[model samples]
Target: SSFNRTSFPDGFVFGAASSAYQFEGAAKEGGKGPNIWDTFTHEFPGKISNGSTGDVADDFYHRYKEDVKVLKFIGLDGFRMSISWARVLPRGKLSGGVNKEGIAFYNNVINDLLSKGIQPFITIFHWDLPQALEDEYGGFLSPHIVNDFRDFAELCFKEFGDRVKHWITMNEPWSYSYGGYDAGLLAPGRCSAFMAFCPKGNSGTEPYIVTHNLLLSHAAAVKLYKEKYQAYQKGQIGITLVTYWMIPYSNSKADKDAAQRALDFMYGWFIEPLSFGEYPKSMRRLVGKRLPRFTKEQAMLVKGSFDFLGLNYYIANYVLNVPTSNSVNLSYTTDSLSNQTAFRNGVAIGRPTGVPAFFMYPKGLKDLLVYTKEKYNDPVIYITENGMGDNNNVTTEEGIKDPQRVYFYNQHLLSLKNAIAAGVKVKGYFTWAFLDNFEWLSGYTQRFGIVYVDFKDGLKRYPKHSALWFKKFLL
Candidate 1:
């Protein structure tokens, strides 16, 4: 295969990605306060598979130096990680007093990565809202989160902006809104009784409200960075959005429209505001009063706020047009008037993976890139997170031989190369995770990391075959 680092443009980045809550284990150590995840995992043990928590997740908080050594060994160009909000600002406010220990921890990580010649792409927030803010104003459900998020972002800029060049404001706000509010599967789980056994939330209204505030918070952070820090620190900032590429169930006008509507509801929901300063026409027509509108000033502030686009693509789904229901129980889940399924005529779209609803479809990645170019004015794009997951019950020896994951990366990179040849302004690619750690509600049952961590055996790190494949591809 002629696919390697030399196959792409010069200076293209190759790295592995991670998040704070999933990677960092010292949840209560180093002057850290609790976040919604800490509360969610402890309070609702049944919510996570295996009834497990991230209490000692890979012990990254204490072992990042060793992890950085692994990154160097893999010849990675960069490492994408998020800062724990509760660690830095325990109460999620400037008035709560910043935690010096927390700040120093990130400084050490950054310096260590730079020392190893690995760039640090820092994400300011990754759905780990400080519990204090959640208790005070319901987290992203209220407008109050905008200023608090901006202040938190400012603190990161003032503390860590010098060496960190790439800043992602939030990772997959779509997942945060849909998982936490609509499906009630992730942290701060909330949804209507109709959707789940959730105790508190209106799935119809709360997801929209949460997404609206999240967009505003992202815009506020981007504005603060551009106005005050970008000129001096010279770093690029953007938000990460995740969605499956939509395929029309058949060659019919209604089905095609449904497919587009699915994209609008998922990817375009956030990208449209950042690109054209408004929600999609399909959303405005369908959601109506349930959807929030941006003010004139807010619209201007949100439009063109990013210097780049961080996108996460994993799978694709076939969409069929569904008739609108006259039921009193409304939800964002059903508002698209489209039904998504991995099967078309009882045939899976691609090879099925261990994770539910995730199939191996490399063509979707290229299709999504081209669509983003034609529809969103061709902003600089990074394939922020892309990888497959496997069940964690396998032995370490069997887990380390990940030929399927090797194939997954090879095909996805081929698609990315084709997208670049089509002029999609692609920049870099980072796999979903660098190490196997706590995987949210699915917990440790699903492993998406190239580096396998033996959770039972002192969390020993072993680079699976996929890691060696990347080491060769990057070489």
Candidate 2:
């Protein structure tokens, strides 16, 4: 499992990842507008740890020039960042007008990255739906969002596609659907009454609807890129999906089948449609008419829409068989009929990490890559976001001496190298984050970055032992 930069294919990339809402802090500055996240944090302060907001997260907006230097210092080949839909189109529509300052700020960021020899990998959406769109219509719940999303993507293509060679249409549809719709743990949180105090939302119906629309929006964006932008811009377009590799809790056939179902519900929900133009057979059979159907034309648009696939692997789960519920109150959580857990008989799947339910399971990454290559036709792939977070309770000094983070990367990288040698078309890898910042509902309670930011101070950045490992390994 030992390897170095020379172990990977020549020109294979290594980078760090960041999202606009998590990294950029200029929530109301630079002519920027509000998004669902701002509303979620402000209205439901109880949802987030310490009732924190991203109003000044990392201040990447004001200091990206400085951050690019951090990337250079880390010896990264590139950096993954997302465009704030509200920042660029304040009202979420061309009719609402474009924000010139927002465009200029991104231009500066991109120019700075290239100037510092860092490639810009941009994500079009990262769960930060413009608040305007949500108010006009229930964001991804309504089919009307498809055209608006396409138009916004087209604007990005026209403006930035020339220099941006890699484009991810959306970050994680499964996470967005499950967290926002079913679990109601994230922004625009909603769930059935079964989950007390959910206030609104039909969990069973909405998750399927939201996921369906996300797939359509992704396909439309990829289609537009291929037809209009990719031809001349020479950029590749795709989508990013996140999933925890599943393991059977027991050797029984029922547990084995449950493992597959867990994967189908999480990874296959989007991958199946993107590859074969429909939901997995298991999902269709279980969800029945509640699952939306894609028209022939819609299916064609979705199938084979990407030049590559972006995968984010963080943890693995042990799945056990669960009896299907016949109750009138249906929910996506139970629709899969699989019980997912991180432990078995008091034994965890892997060594516990800073985050609950997440454990160090590097072999899962290699298995996932091999599985994807066999199940879906082999496609170029990027490990878009992979890293472990720590409880941000330690001092900055203690955080910077992160030995577990170093070991986590070492094991994962070794597994990654194996996946490549095993014939998976892995072209690049980018860790979950580059800096410690607000971590959504957990807020600053969890730190996932290799660079420790002194939140108590002025968000000063310091490289951890893991960053040093990457520096030496990439060399």
Q: What are the TM-scores, per candidate, against the unseen true structure?
A: 0.99, 0.98
How far is 469's C-alpha from truth in model 1 (Å)?
0.8
Candidate 1, superposed: residue stretches over 4 Å from native: none
Candidate 1 structure, TM-score to reference: 0.99
Give the range where candidate 2 is weakest over 10 consecutive residues by summed lDDT.
323-332
Residue range 1-475, candidate 2, lDDT tens digits: 3357999999999999999999999999999889999999988888999999899999999988888898999899989999999999999988899999999988999999999888999999999999999999999999999999999999999889889999999999998999999988888989898788467898989999999999999999999999877778988998999988999999999999999999999999999999999999999999999999999999999999899999999999999999765676688889888999998999888887889878999999999999999988998999999999999888889989999999999899999999999999999999988998889999998999989999998899999999888988888
Per-residue C-alpha lDDT of model 1 across residues 1-475, encoded as one tens digit per residue: 7568999999999999999999998999999999999999999889999888888888899999999999999999989999999999999998999999999999999999999899999999998999999999999999999999999999999999998989999999999999999888888999998765688998889999999899999999999999899998988999898989999999999999999999999998999999999999999999999999999998999999899999999999999999876777678888899999999988999987889889999999999999999999988999999999998878999998999999999999999999999999999999988998799998999999999999878899999999998988888
lDDT of every predicted structure (CA atoms): 0.93, 0.92
Model 2 vs. true fold: TM: 0.98
What RMSD does each model have against the real structure?
1.0, 1.2
lDDT of 1 at 185: 89
Could you tell me how far off, in angstroms, the CA of residue 279 lies in candidate 2 after the best superposition? 0.6
